[PDB]
Amino acid sequence: ARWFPKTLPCDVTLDVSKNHVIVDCTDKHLTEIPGGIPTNTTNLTLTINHIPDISPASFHRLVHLVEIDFRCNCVPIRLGSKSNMCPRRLQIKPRSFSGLTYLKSLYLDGNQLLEIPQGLPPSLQLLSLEANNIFSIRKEQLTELANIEILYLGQNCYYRNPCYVSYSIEKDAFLNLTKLKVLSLKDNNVTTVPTVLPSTLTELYLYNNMIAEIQEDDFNNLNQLQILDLSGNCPRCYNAPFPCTPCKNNSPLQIPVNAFDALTELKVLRLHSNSLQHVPPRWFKNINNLQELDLSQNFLAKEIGDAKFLHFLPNLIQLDLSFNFELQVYRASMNLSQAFSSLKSLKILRIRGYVFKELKSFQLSPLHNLQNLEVLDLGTNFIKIANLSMFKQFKRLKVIDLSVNKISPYDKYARSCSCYKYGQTLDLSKNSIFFIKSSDFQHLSFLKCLNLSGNLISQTLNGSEFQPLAELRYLDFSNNRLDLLHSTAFEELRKLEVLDISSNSHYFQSEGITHMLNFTKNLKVLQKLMMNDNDISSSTSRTMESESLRTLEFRGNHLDVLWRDGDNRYLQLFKNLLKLEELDISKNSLSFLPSGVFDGMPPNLKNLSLAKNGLKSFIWEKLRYLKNLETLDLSHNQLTTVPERLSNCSRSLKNLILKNNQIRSLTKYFLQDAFQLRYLDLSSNKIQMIQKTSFPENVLNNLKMLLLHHNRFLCTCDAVWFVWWVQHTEVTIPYLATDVTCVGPGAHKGQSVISLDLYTCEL
């Protein structure tokens, strides 16, 4: 099959059409790069490791490298886990990258460098030096980057990685970079923008810095700029969960009126957390193609009432005005200006953090004509009175956020080391609704969704609550207190397809009261039912019936009491679910499955999940009754013995999952004649040996995935074929060189099975 044993502990991906040989050593804890790298490699990745340094002998016989990822080998003091500490910082000998004539990208983030390395090839187009200790920019060290295009010099001096010195950039340091397009100086303690910047810049990220004043001759040459991020300069420090230094006298970022003049191709402008109080319309005079405008965490509560600058943004797509409230000011209503009607191309409008008392109908009148408006975020506003019927005008919308408000009837780009698909959505989750009336949801027949998660509604539904919701296809009733006393629950939701009544264990924990689990009989088009984490311990109805239910999640419940010894009542609980194909009966404290319960299983079942249950002895001969089962899931269980013969067990099972099990040895005809298998998991086990008579190539040649890591393989001369099978077969085994180790014998401890060579076996 294979006579080329490659002991490389890194993943290899081949793309002949793209000429890409990707070697991936992510999270491999290597101290030195492995020997024998194929010379056709193009992409090279080395994440968090323990590699001390780099020498020119590292990339000596690799010229075709086009991407080198050396990110975060020695993470700084506060940016990563302190379980992997380097003795010192990273050092690079001179001319360590000059031999890479085809290099085009380099990632050196989080390695505690003092200055920019020298000797880089002129073909380099990307260079990222984030999370380093480079707080000084000069021209002589940038002369070699005359052909760079993307430069990430961010996260160099701030509270996570301090340097105690303001960012020093000499005059015209980036001027001679005629090919530079992206420049990110985020979290660098920058005092002034490094003028002059190259005129070919397209993305400028100067956010989360200490820039206090902007000059009129700052962006005077940037005519091709498209993204300008000045967020966090003079930030809003009140109740900030991060160390922030505000400006003196609580002054905002001093931006002149004639500042965004040369910016003509600007499409994204984020001024989030700048302590701004006024937004002059002169800023938006020359930027005609502005699409995204972030103005969050400011003091624009009085500006939103006027909002004159909105008259200069006819092509605005997004508008973030979150958390603009005043201190000790509880407003009675939201004061949206009429100029909001000038945003013709507006799609998303998030006005969170604008806390007020009552949301009336005519308060959203400027938004009554935005034909392109889809999302309307109004969460975290602590609204008290809000008649939902007023939303009968926003039918063309897609998301109506009515979040944690109490209606009643820093660096988000940190690259560290639902209902929107069904239609109209009313997200009333985490509100102060404690009972459901039919008149409250009136004039809301167009709703395809209704999220009532976390409202803590204690109500006995008899089939008269969600009456106006005729077109409802998804109802989220999680984190409440549902009382299933009548089988007529959710009977008026004719077009209901998905029902989530999870986390309603309050009334289900009680013993003796009626629990009609046959409430799905009146649901004719119900496709998915999520009732997990409900602690369902009893049920008056004996069976569950449905003409269309295909998915059922019954995890975190008590089937161990329903299938108790001698209690033959609830054995056929899911037998009448004809169209059921996806069962998720897991975490149900099931210590054993009583013989006969599989006879009360849906005949069309395909997906069975029995994870985190506690099965002490799961029988296998009863799987013949499930002639359509394909994805049996027995992960995180306490099984002891694997089946006798998988061929006699099932004819359609192909996705056996036995993760985190307790198995000490496989059988000797396990995979005999089980050709239909295509997926097997045996991770985190206690097995000792696996022979050949149970693993022939007729069955191994078709398996797509096979996980045999984190176990107790004893690598002695007892399973020599396994050796000849582990390093000479192309079956996909992930983590085959670092996680699956050898616990013995003696000097053979911790050895990888891929590099096994016992010459003293057949001398």
Q: Which residues bind its own copies (CB under 8 A)?
A: 78, 159, 238-243, 327-328, 330, 355, 357, 382, 384, 406, 408-409, 432, 434-435, 437, 458-460, 483, 506-507, 510-513
**Residue 462 C-beta: closest distance to ligand GJX, Å:** 9
Task: Enumerate the β-bridge partners of residue 746.
Answer: none
**CA 647, CA 672: separation in Å to the nearest integer?**
7
User: 382 among the known binding-site residues?
Assistant: yes
Q: Which is nearer to its own copies, 55 or 250 (CB)?
A: 250
Instruction: Give least dist CB 455 to its own copies, A.
Output: 12
634: which 2 tokens? 């027995």
For ligand GJX, the closer CB: 83 or 328: 328
What value, to the nearest 5°, has the Cα angle with vertex 507 and ends 501 and 510? 140
With CB under 5 to 8 Å by kind, the binding choice for 694 among its own copies, ligand GJX, none is none
Taking Cα atoms as reference points, which of 190, 170, 343 lies closest to residue 253? 190
Please, which residue, 78 or 728, has the CB nearer to its own copies? Answer: 78
Residue 80 CB, shortest distance to its own copies, in Å, is: 14
Contacts of 265 (CB under 8 A, 6+ apart): 223, 224, 225, 226, 289
Omega cis (within 30) before 745:
yes
The 3-state secondary structure of 577-621 reads ECCCCEECCCCCCCCCCCCCHHHHCCCCCCEEECCCCCCCCCCCH
C-alpha angle with apex 711: 706 to 717, nearest 5 degrees?
Answer: 95
Q: Which is nearer to ligand GJX, 331 or 645 (CB)?
A: 331
757 is in an annotated binding site: yes
**Smallest separation (angstroms) from its own copies to the CB of 540:** 11
Dist. CA 674–CA 70, nearest whole Å: 45
CB of 237 to ligand GJX, least distance (A): 12
CA dist., res. 323 & res. 421, Å (int): 28
Task: Residue 510: name its binding partner from ligand GJX, its own copies, none (Cβ under 5 to 8 Å by kind).
Answer: its own copies
Residue 505 CA: distances (Å) to CA of 121, 545, 562, 689? 63, 22, 16, 45
Residue 456 contact partner, candidates its own copies, ligand GJX, none, CB within 5 to 8 A by sort of partner:
ligand GJX
> By C-alpha distance, which of 688, 695, 691 is closest to 713?
688
Shortest reach from residue 364's CB to its own copies, in Å: 22
Annotated binding residue 718: no
When computed from its CA atoms, the radius of gyration of the chain, rounded to whole angstroms, is 32
705 binds, among its own copies, ligand GJX, none (CB under 5 to 8 A by kind): none
**DSSP H or E run through 508:** helix 505-508
Report the interface residues with ligand GJX, using CB under 6 A.
Answer: 325, 327-330, 355, 380, 434-435, 456, 458-459, 481
Query: Would you say 483 is a known binding-site residue?
Result: yes
- Cβ atoms 555, 579 nearer than 8 A: no
- 264 is an annotated ligand-binding site residue: no
Residue 406 or 659 having the CB closest to ligand GJX? 406
Nearer Cβ to ligand GJX, position 456 or 720? 456
- Where does 619-667 have alpha helices with state H? 646-649
User: Among residues 288 and 460, whose Cβ is nearest to its own copies?
Assistant: 460
Cα–Cα distance between 563 and 541 in angstroms, integer? Answer: 14
> Which residue, 369 or 460, has its beta carbon nearer to its own copies?
460
Residue 444, both tokens: 């809301």
Pick what 570 binds: ligand GJX, its own copies, none; C-beta below 5 to 8 Å, kind-dependent.
none
Where do runs of H (alpha helix) occur along 228-352? 301-306
- Given ligand GJX, its own copies, none, residue 409, with its beta carbon under 5 to 8 Å by kind, binds its own copies
User: Among its own copies, ligand GJX, none, what binds residue 725 when CB lies within 5 to 8 Å by partner kind?
Assistant: none
> Measured from the CB of residue 483, what is the shortest distance to ligand GJX in angstroms?
9
CB 10 within 8 A of CB 24: yes
Which of its own copies, ligand GJX, none binds 432 (CB below 5-8 Å, type-dependent)?
Answer: its own copies
What minimum distance in Å lies between the beta carbon of 456 and ligand GJX?
4
- Rounded least distance, CB 4 to its own copies, Å: 51
Select from ligand GJX, its own copies, none the partner in contact with residue 532, using the beta carbon and a kind-dependent cut-off of 5 to 8 Å.
Answer: none
Q: Which residues are annotated as a binding site for guanosine?
A: 382, 406, 483, 514
Q: Which residues are annotated as a binding site for Ca(2+)?
A: 757
Q: Which residues are annotated as a binding site?
A: 382, 406, 483, 514, 757
